[model samples]
Target: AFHDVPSLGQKVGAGSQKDVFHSRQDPRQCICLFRPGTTGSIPAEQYAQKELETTKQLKNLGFPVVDAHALVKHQGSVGVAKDFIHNALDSEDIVNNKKSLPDNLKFNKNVLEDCNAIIRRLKNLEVHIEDLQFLVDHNGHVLINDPRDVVRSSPDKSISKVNELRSHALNNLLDI
Candidate 1:
């Protein structure tokens, strides 16, 4: 069972607004704690809350996203406990050539097709993810790893952006 503030293990990763740590109580989970004094239009607590809501929406829709277990708070920072995908690499790293995928794994048309399918589904839901940060897990499966950036968009804009994202997904995600 998770409490309001859970014991955190070693630091694993950090994002623009939060730092992720392994959960001491649950090895399968990680804690994403919002960094204090992070500059943003909204408070970090709201981001955590909204991310929880967004994650639930995506999961209910059968979208491939990291599962969020609970929202927590420590001191003055807000956080979330989520499933920790072991040995995963962010798509941004591969796209920019900062990291390399396994030689056995290749980003082909199938990957592009999968992304397009997800984009189309999100379009229908009026959910817009400005940063579609995909992560490659230990088993080479791709999944949505970020929920904080997902937002609602107008239907017309989403329709147009869906097409744009298809090309964007192809050019940036493939060819690595």
Candidate 2:
């Protein structure tokens, strides 16, 4: 009802609000995220703008995330259109199950490879990841997530800060 329904090859996902659908027009199936509402918290325009800006910034920064498409406003809700991933899985599932250790290990190695690639790119740009974590899929591909802690240059914070905040977070992590 917004503008157009997604067709094959179009990206599609409900936004945080989960109301309207977002998708590209030309080739159709690309990527789309739905935004549901703008009732209780903030205006849809403001929310969408902020999300779009951040998304663009992250893309520019080479952070791993789906590319954002047009921001659509429909039925008092907001949505973002972008490219969609074909087959994906959530990270929580991968970390919890052990039976899939072999595959998970492979995925984990890929994650580190991606992280190292990102780090290499950042170094070329004189930027730094500062802090990062691998988000593995229970049954599919892995990716990087929770990038809010990313910094532009060398992290001004100290290892002590991480120890204080995360405690034993890295106790089991291996660098490579």
Candidate 3:
């Protein structure tokens, strides 16, 4: 951690990889501090770097994602300061919030198209969004806000793997 650091005002959340703190200076921003667990990934520096790069890439694209602002070190680990994406629901977020998916929900033309669009985006970016949970963004389209189990590769190779993934994803949506 460095001196004269911008304030990380309050602890907002915690997880296996990192802890989140509200940004003191910005109203809709938070700071994520990387913290690796011992039993899982031994000295998970690679993961931290990968996550940082991945979020930045998504933010650069027009895709709906958290606004990844800056990367720094906090408490001797990698940290990222980004838009808060408030009132969002991760899978567990909703479960924790006592929310449930409505039974009458339907996957219409627009929904399938959005799913395919995100899949195509993953293919283009050479990344895979696995175990997906889409957040309903203000734009009326689905936003993949937290794709934790991301796998990145060279564009061509990634596309090859993502094809099956795309097929798999589409099939799931079509089923429901």
Candidate 4:
């Protein structure tokens, strides 16, 4: 179980199959991402099971993911819980928001250095994030967000995969 009880009145961002809740705690504003059941198409139990499995896999991959806390079944509704990251900026937000880019560029060198540090860490852990996307924050800080399309492989695979994904993601950024 990830969380014993979810805090009330917490604002959450909903995706197609999940909802990410921001924590109201100190030092770590961990997120609680809930994956609920589909309306009437997919079976609620089956969906929850798959989501729980997926969450476990993500955690195993050394990604920033929390485990499922509880599974409630009522009226065919199912939910799985996990930790979340507050103040996390998405890739799209940074790309479309031009006003934030200038300041972000001012600290671009440091941010890039930080990114390289992350890459080094991943290498040390033997985790290859071949495809990923990041966003710049209000303080000109860059944060890596989306990594669903990332590939975890060996050193050679990591290099080639990162080159391709970086090229594509950068092209997309330029177009934005």
Candidate 5:
């Protein structure tokens, strides 16, 4: 339940652990409010803080991710405000769009390679992304939609996960 959270616009999206809203003061940004309880083992209370830190770290490393601006509070709930990527489609949406597109129409190879490049870089960094929920904007830039799903892992432990992520990205690119 959000109350007294200024500059928070209408709800635009909701995830497994949080609700997302447009920024009242800035159309280019949105605010994500963590819901009560936990997802996996991480408490909802820590979602905003953790995501803010993780996103900032990735952004500094030149990862194509939305900009995390600041943390906001909704009573007991914590939220993070970040750049709102407009006219972007998630991986699922991309798949659906691909299916609906004309048979002869295809995604550009360069675009697919760019997506692979991002995943390749992630693997080289040894970052364990439990869910690489990819988002592609109108500019054809691939971005990670959820930084909260990311964690640093040792090289040995991260290899398989990164490989899985790579495969998943490849599947999305080729199959759909």
Candidate 6:
């Protein structure tokens, strides 16, 4: 479906690596295209491949994500696709809002608990989350709209850092 269309809609998101366009097919699903010029030494196809791997891993762990392996074609360039996120705001907004708005998603205790489990699961794969966000669902479940910010790692391993914080919380250093 992403390949068949040329122009989808206004750009919902833009980045050095890729640009996302809203799909009339579904607001929950947006089309993402990789920009070769922005990826440094990594080629666009390889970047998409890596995201596919991440997508599989996250899904196995019960995390919500936009399918990273999903391919799209535009002007001879292919890109990735995401699912189930509509009118969502990035968590960086949390810095401004101090907390999620009443109808917005939040990193509340329930979500922190979810993250705690996610950290332990990801540790085995040497991957971690650098940026985490939650999208509010009318069904009342929080969905991770940006799971691919999900990175792997060592020097920047936020997974272990998170688990360690969980340990601190258990010590009552953090109370929910």
TM-score to native of every candidate shown: 0.73, 0.50, 0.56, 0.44, 0.68, 0.60
lDDT, candidate 4, at 71? 47
Count of backbone collisions in candidate 1: 0
Across 64-111, the per-residue lDDT of candidate 3 in tens digits comes to: 556566665655656666677554433343334444322222423333
Worst 10 residues of 2 by lDDT: 163-172
lDDT of model 2 at position 160: 26
lDDT winner: 1
Residue 117 Cα positional deviation in candidate 5, in Å, after optimal superposition: 1.4
List where candidate 4 sits over 4 angstroms from the true fold.
14-17, 24-31, 36-87, 92-102, 129-152, 155-176
lDDT of 2 by residue, 90-118 (tens): 33333434223233445445554554555
Q: Mind giving the per-residue lDDT tens digits that candidate 5 earns over 1-176?
A: 22246556888753555678888867898887776664556765466667777787777877778777887776666777778877655555445444221222233443455556766666688776554555555555566666665666743443443343344445545655
Q: Against the hidden true structure, what lDDT does model 6 obtain?
A: 0.55
lDDT against the true structure, each candidate: 0.67, 0.42, 0.52, 0.44, 0.61, 0.55
State the lDDT of candidate 1 residue by residue for 1-176, as single tens digits. Answer: 22476456898864555788888878999888878676377877677777777777777887778888898876666778889988877766666667665544344344556566676777678776654566656765567765655567744543444344345445655455
Candidate 2 residues lying further than 4 Å off, grouped into runs, are 1-40, 92-106, 116-176
Better of 1 and 4 by lDDT: 1
Clashing pairs in 3: none
Ranked by lDDT, top first: 1, 5, 6, 3, 4, 2
Model 4 TM: 0.44
